Amino acid sequence: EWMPVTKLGRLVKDMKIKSLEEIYLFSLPIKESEIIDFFLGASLKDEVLKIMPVQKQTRAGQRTRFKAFVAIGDYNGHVGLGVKCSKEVATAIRGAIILAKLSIVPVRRGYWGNKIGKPHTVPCKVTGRCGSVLVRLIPAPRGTGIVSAPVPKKLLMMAGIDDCYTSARGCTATLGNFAKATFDAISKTYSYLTPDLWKETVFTKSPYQEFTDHLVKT
Amino acid sequence: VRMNVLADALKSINNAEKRGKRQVLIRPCSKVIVRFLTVMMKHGYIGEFEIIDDHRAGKIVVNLTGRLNKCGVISPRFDVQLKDLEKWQNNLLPSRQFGFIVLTTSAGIMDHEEARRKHTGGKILGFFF
Amino acid sequence: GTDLVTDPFEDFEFNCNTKYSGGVTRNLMRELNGG
Amino acid sequence: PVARSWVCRKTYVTPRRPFEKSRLDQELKLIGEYGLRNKREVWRVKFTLAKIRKAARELLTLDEKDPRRLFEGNALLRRLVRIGVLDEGKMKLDYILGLKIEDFLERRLQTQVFKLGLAKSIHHARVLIRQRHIRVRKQVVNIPSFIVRLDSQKHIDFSLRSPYGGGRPGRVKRKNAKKG
Amino acid sequence: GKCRGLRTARKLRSHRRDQKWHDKQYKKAHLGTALKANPFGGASHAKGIVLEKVGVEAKQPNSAIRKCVRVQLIKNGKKITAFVPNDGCLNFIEENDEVLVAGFGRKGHAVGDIPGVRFKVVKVANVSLLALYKGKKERPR
Amino acid sequence: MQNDAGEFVDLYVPRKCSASNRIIGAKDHASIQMNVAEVDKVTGRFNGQFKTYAICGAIRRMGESDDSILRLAKADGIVSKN
Amino acid sequence: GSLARAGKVRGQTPKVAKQEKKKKKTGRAKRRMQYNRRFVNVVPTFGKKKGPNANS
RNA sequence: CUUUAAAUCCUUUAACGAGGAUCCAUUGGAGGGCAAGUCUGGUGCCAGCAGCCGCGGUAAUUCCAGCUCCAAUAGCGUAUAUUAAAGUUGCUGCAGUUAAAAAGCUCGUAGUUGGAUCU
C-alpha cells in the first residue's frame, strides 16, 4: 500500500479524481509517481533509452556515476521522459522510471487531411529545442508511419503518434538532448492554439476546491 | 530605409501579439495594409481596427484577440500560379486544417482558399496562422 | 572449482571503460529491453 | 538500330537501414506467415503498396472536382477493389492510405490455395502451385505470386491432369504400383 | 544578410558559383590538378610491374610491418606503393611480375595505420589474391 | 477537436489565460486559478458563488498579473468603475 | 623493416579439418526454420534475454 | 518436324529421372557504428585485422583456424565516379563577438531595393 504525502495524492487515492486529464487541466504538479500508476494502469510501457557513464575527476582518480534516460508512456496519448544519475545502474534506472512517470505529458493527436476516424498524427508542425538540438514534427498522411531517427521514433511511438514526418538539426548524437527536444516538441502539441480551441473556456471547479469538504474532513 | 510597409505592419502585429498586448499601433497605413487586415479579420484572427487619419499617412490601432500565432510577409512578392499554390502552403502553413496564405490577384487581395475558388493565381503577400 | 556469475548490470558497471565497453553496453541494453 | 525494347523496371527497393531489429522481425514474421522465399518478396509487395499510396496522395492533393482526380481515383479504387484488397463499400481515395502489406499478401495464389483447403500449410500451397497442381478457371497457374482477382477466387481448383484433381497417378505412385 | 530581390538571380547564381570553389570536394573534382596528379588517371584499377617488395612500419599507436609492393604502372609509368592485403600474400608476389592494383577505399586518402599507402593489390599474374589465399587457384608458372 | 462525423477526439480542452486568451500548458506550475467571491447587493455577504480567472505563468512572471486581475474584476462588476 | 616473417601465423596454425555435418536447407525452408525458431519457439529462453549465439 | 527461311529455345506429349531427396548454395561477417560467441585451440605489438574508433606486448569478444550463430541469397564482396544523407554551398535554407569568418574608415558608379496617395 501507498500512503499519500500530498493533497493531490490524497484526493487521487480516495477515488475522487476521475482522470489524469483533470490534473492536466489545472496544471497541478505530480509529486508522487503513484498517481500516474493509479491513473494509467499497466498500459504504461517503459524503455531505457540510454545508460551513459559520467565521470568526475578526483584526486585519487575518477568517480563514475551512471545516468539513465528512460522513456515511458501508454501508446494512446501520454508520454514521459526521465533522466536520473546514480552510483549504480539499477538505482539510476529505477529513479529514471520514477521521474519519467512524474513527467507524463498529454499528447494532442490530429489529422493530416480528411478527419476520418481516430486522430493519427500531430495537429500541426511543432518544434522542440534542447541545447542546440531542434526537432520538428510535421503531420503526415495516414499509414506513413514515423519518419524519424530511432530515438524520436521510440518517443513518438510511445506517445501514440501513428504517423509523423520529422526534421532534426544540431548535435543529435547527444541522445539526451535529442530525446529532450523530441519530448519538448511532443509536449508543445497541447499548447498550440488552433482555431478549434477559440471557444471561450468554461471553468470547472478545481479539485483542491471541488472536494474541500473531503480534505477538511480527513 | 523603410521599404515594404506591410512587413513593418505585420512585424508590429506579431511582436505585440507575442507580448500579450490588446492593441497595436501600426504606422504608416496603406491600402495593402488595410486589405491584409480585413482578410485577417474576416477569419477572426485580428478583430476590430480603426484608421487614424492624419493628413500625411494614416495610422491604424488594431485591437488584438490572442488567436494569432504568427503573421508574416513574404518578400519579394513572388508571382505564384495556381498549380504552384499548394507547394507554398506546404512551406508556410502549420497544417492543412488552419492557416492562410494571402495573395494579391487581379480580382483583389484574398486568402489562398478564395484564390482557388475564384481560379486565379497572383503574388504572395504574406501568411497568418 | 567454480566461478561466480555476473549480472549484466555489474558487468556494465565494471567494464564501462575497458575493451569490453561495447559488449557490456549491448548486453545491458538486451537485459533492459530485449523482447 | 534494333527492333527490341529496353523498357525494364525494378520491382522492389532495399531498406535504408541494413540491420534494424524491428524491421527484421516484422519482415521475418511476414515471411513465416505467408511462406515467402526471401525478403525480396516482402520488399516487392511493399514497393507496390508504396506506389499505390503515392498515387493516392497525388490525387488527394488535387481539387475534389478535378476531372483528372475523379478519373484516376475511380480507376485506382476500382483496381484495388477488383483484386480484393479494398472493400466495395469504402471506395474513397482516403481509404487507400489505410491499406497494409498484409492485404496484398492475402491475395497471392499461395495464400488463397492454403485458405481454400487445397493445401495443409502455406509452404504446401507454394509447393503445390510450383508443381503444377493448381489451376485458376481453366488455366494451370504455376506462379505462387499470382494475385487473385475477386472474380477468380471461386475458380481455384486442383487441375485436371494432376494426381490430386485428375486421376492419373504420378511418377512415384506408378513406380511403386509397378512392383505389384 | 543575403539579397532578397526579384531581380537578384544573377547575383545569387554568381555568388554561389564563386563560393562553390571553397568547397574542398568540388574544387578537388573540378580544378583538374587532382586528376592530373592521380596515378590511376581517374581509373578504379591499374596494372603494374612489381619493382620490389617493401615493408612499411605502422603508425605510432600500434606496431607492425605492412608488406607492400613498389610497382610501376603500365599506363603512365608512375611508381606506386600498393599494400598486399592478407597474410602470406607477399609470398605469392614475385619481382617484375604484373599485378592488378585497386584503391584502398578512402578515395586517395591513406587508410588505417599504413602511412602513405593508398593502394592495395587485387590480382597477381592474372589470378586473384583471394583465390590464391583460399587455395582455389595455384600460381601459374 | 471533431472528426468528420462530429465526435470530440481531444483528450481534454486546456484552460486559456483569462488575460491573453492563450492556452495554459499542462506543466505551467506558475499559472493560477483565482476565485473571487461574489457579494450580496444589500448585505455585502458571501453568496456562495464566485468568479474564476485563470492566469498563465508568463503574465505572473512579467508582473502584469495584478493589473490583469484588476482589469478582469473591473470588467466583471466586482471592482467599481474608477 | 624485415620481410622474413610473411604468413608466419597462418603458416604455423595447426590445421583442423572441417567436421562433416548435415546440409542446411535453402530458400523458403531456411526462412521457415528461422521463423519457427524465432517466433513460434518461446519456451527455450532462460529468462536472461540473451542472444542466439551466447555460450556463457 | 510445335516453333522457324532449313535445325534451335522454353510451350505441348511420352520414357527414364530423389531420404545424406551426395540432384550436397554461396558471399561476406559475429567489440561498437551494425544483425550476430569476452566459446575452444594457435600466435604473443609478431603475423595480421581494422572504411572509423580501435584489436594484437604468453589469459585476443577483433588476427590464424574449429565449432556455433546472422545478413542478403543465385547471388554477394571490392575499387572508382556520382546522387541522397549535406540545413557540410543553404532560392526554399547555413554561417561571420569568442569555434573559419565584417573590408581600417568614408565617399561613390554600374547593380539591387525603394514611403502614403487616384472608385
Best of F1, F22, F74 to disrupt the B interface by mutation (most B CBs within 10 Å)?
F22
Grid coordinates given for D112: 488463397
Rounded CA separation B48/B59 (Å) = 14
List Cβ neighbours of E21 (8 Å cut-off, separation of 6 or more). Answer: E27, E30
For residues A22 and A207, is the Cβ–Cβ distance under 8 A? yes
For residues A70 and A82, is the Cβ–Cβ distance under 8 A? yes
Rounded CA separation A99/A81 (Å) = 7
What is each CA distance from D69 to A8, A15, B56, D55, D77, in whole angstroms? 56, 54, 52, 10, 12
Q: Using a CB-CB distance cutoff of 8 angstroms, which residues of chain A are in contact with residue D94?
A: 113-114, 116, 142
Residues B2 and B56 in one domain: yes
Strand pairing category for A164-169 and A146-147: parallel
Residue that is written with C-alpha cell 604484373 in the block: E98
Q: Please report, as a single letter, which amino acid is at residue A85.
A: C
Domain segments of chain D: what residues?
18-180
Its sign, for the CA torsion A168, A173, A177, A180, is: positive
Residue G8: nearest nucleotide (C-alpha to C1'): H47
Indicate yes or no: CB of A143 within 8 angstroms of CB of D57. no
Indicate yes or no: CB of B66 within 8 angstroms of CB of F21. yes
Indicate yes or no: CB of D60 within 8 angstroms of CB of A113. yes
G28 CB neighbours strand H below 7 A: no
Neighbouring C-beta atoms of residue E140, cutoff 10 Å = 7
Grid coordinates given for E96: 617484375
**Which residues 59-88 on chain A approach chain C with CB closer than 8 angstroms?**
64, 66, 88
Grid coordinates given for D56: 493516392
CA dihedral E108, E112, E116, E121 (to 10 degrees): -70
| Structural domain harbouring F62 | 1-82
Rounded CA separation F54/A205 (Å) = 12
Residues B56 and B106 in one domain: no
Please name which of A169, A67, A81 lies closest in space to residue F27, comparing C-alpha atoms.
A81
Q: Helix/strand/coil (H, E, C) string of chain E? A: CCCCCCCCHHHHHHHHHHHHHHCHHHHHHHHCHHHHHCCCCCCCEEEEEEEEEEEEECCCCCCCEEEEEEEEECCCCCEEEEECCCCCCCCCCCCCCEEEEEECCCCCCCCCCCCCCCEEEEEECCEEHHHHHCCCCCCCC
Please name which of F57, F36, F60 lies closest in space to residue F47, comparing C-alpha atoms.
F36
Rounded CA separation G27/D31 (Å) = 11
Strand pairing category for A133-138 and A126-130: antiparallel
What would you measure as the largest C-alpha separation in chain E, in angstroms? 73
Q: Please report, as a single letter, which amino acid is at residue B63.
A: N
E114 CB neighbours strand H below 7 A: yes
Three-state DSSP state, A106: strand
Three-state DSSP state, A200: coil
- Name residue B60's beta-bridge partners: B26, B51
Distance linking the first and last C-alpha atoms of chain E:
71
- Name residue E101's beta-bridge partners: E46, E121
Please name which of B9, B32, B41 lies closest in space to residue B125, comparing C-alpha atoms.
B32
Residues B47 and B99 in one domain: no
- Domain count along chain B: 2
Q: Do chains G and C touch (3 or more CB pairs under 8 A)?
A: yes
Determined by which method?
cryo-EM
Rounded CA separation B11/B25 (Å) = 11
D37 CB neighbours strand H below 7 A: yes
Q: The domain that contains B123 carries what CATH number?
A: 3.30.1490.10
DSSP symbols for F59-73? HHHHT-HHHHHHHHH
Q: Using a CB-CB distance cutoff of 8 angstroms, which residues of chain B are in contact with residue F59?
A: 20
Q: Please report, as a single letter, which amino acid is at residue A48.
A: V
Please name which of B77, B81, B27 lies closest in space to residue B49, comparing C-alpha atoms.
B27
Rounded CA separation E125/E83 (Å) = 16
Indicate yes or no: CB of A195 within 8 angstroms of CB of B94. no
Q: Give, in degrees to the nearest 5, the angle at Cα F22 between F18 and F27.
A: 100
Q: Do chains A and F touch (3 or more CB pairs under 8 A)?
A: yes
Strand pairing category for F46-55 and F32-39: antiparallel
Rounded CA separation F82/F76 (Å) = 13
Please return the burial class of E101, using the count of CB atoms within 10 Å of its CB with bins 0-12, 13-18 and 19+.
Answer: buried
Give chain F's radius of gyration (CA, Å).
16
For residues E120 and E85, is the Cβ–Cβ distance under 8 A? yes
- Closest residue, CA to C1' of H30: G53
- Residue D164 φ/ψ, nearest 5 degrees: -85, -20
DSSP symbols for F15-54? -B-TTT--BPPTT-TT-EEEEEEEE-TTT--EEEEEEEEE
Best of E4, E6, E7 to disrupt the B interface by mutation (most B CBs within 10 Å)?
E6
DSSP symbols for D133-170? --EETTEE---TTPBPPGGGGGGEE--SSSTTTS----
Rounded CA separation E18/E10 (Å) = 12
Its sign, for the CA torsion A31, A37, A43, A48, is: positive
Q: Is D36 left (phi over 0), alpha (psi -120 to 50) or beta?
A: beta
Q: The domain that contains F13 carries what CATH number?
A: 3.30.1230.20
Question: HSE (CB half, 13 Å, CA atoms) of F73?
Answer: 17
What is each CA distance from B117 to B32, B40, B101, D62, D129, in whole angstroms? 21, 18, 14, 13, 55
Three-state DSSP state, A56: strand
| Structural domain harbouring B128 | 69-129
For residues B21 and B64, is the Cβ–Cβ distance under 8 A? yes
Q: Give, in degrees to the nearest 5, the angle at Cα A6 between A5 and A12.
A: 105
For residues B71 and B101, is the Cβ–Cβ distance under 8 A? no
| Partner chains of A (3+ C-beta pairs under 8 Å) | B, C, D, F
Q: Using a CB-CB distance cutoff of 8 angstroms, which residues of chain E are in contact with residue B75?
A: 4
Residues B87 and B103 in one domain: yes
- Closest residue, CA to C1' of H38: C20
Its sign, for the CA torsion D39, D44, D47, D52, is: negative
Residue that is written with C-alpha cell 584503391 in the block: E103
Element (H, E) at B111: strand B108-111
For residues F9 and A118, is the Cβ–Cβ distance under 8 A? yes
Rounded CA separation D105/D102 (Å) = 5
Resolution in A: 2.8
Indicate yes or no: CB of A112 within 8 angstroms of CB of B69. no
Residue that is written with C-alpha cell 504504461 in the block: A44
What is each CA distance from A197 to A188, A190, A191, D156, in whole angstroms? 15, 10, 10, 56
Please return the burial class of D144, using the count of CB atoms within 10 Å of its CB with bins 0-12, 13-18 and 19+.
Answer: buried
E113 CB neighbours strand H below 7 A: yes
| Protein-contacted positions of strand H (CB under 7 Å) | 12-13, 16-18, 20-22, 24-25, 28, 30-39, 41-43, 45-57, 61-74, 78-82, 87-96, 102, 111-118
F81 DSSP assignment: P
What is the CATH number that goes with domain A107-200? Answer: 3.30.230.10
Residues B85 and B107 in one domain: yes
Strand pairing category for A146-147 and A62-73: unpaired
Residue that is written with C-alpha cell 484552460 in the block: F15
**Residue of chain C nearest G50, judged by CA positions:** C30
For residues B102 and B128, is the Cβ–Cβ distance under 8 A? yes
- Name residue B26's beta-bridge partners: B60
Neighbouring C-beta atoms of residue A44, cutoff 10 Å = 21
Q: Please report, as a single letter, which amino acid is at residue A181.
A: A
- Name residue F55's beta-bridge partners: F32
For residues E47 and E22, is the Cβ–Cβ distance under 8 A? no
Indicate yes or no: CB of E4 within 8 angstroms of CB of B76. yes
Residue C8 CA from chain centroid, whole number: 3
- Residue D31 φ/ψ, nearest 5 degrees: -60, -45
Residues spanned by CATH 3.30.230.10 within chain A?
107-200
Please return the burial class of F75, using the count of CB atoms within 10 Å of its CB with bins 0-12, 13-18 and 19+.
Answer: exposed
Rounded CA separation A148/D20 (Å) = 14
| Structural domain harbouring E133 | 1-141
b/e map of B76-112 (b: 16 or more CB within 10 Å)?
ebeebebeebeebbeebbbbbbbbbbbbbbeeebbbb
What is the CATH number that goes with domain A1-106? Answer: 3.30.160.20
- Name residue E50's beta-bridge partners: E71
Rounded CA separation A78/A74 (Å) = 6
Grid coordinates given for B49: 481596427
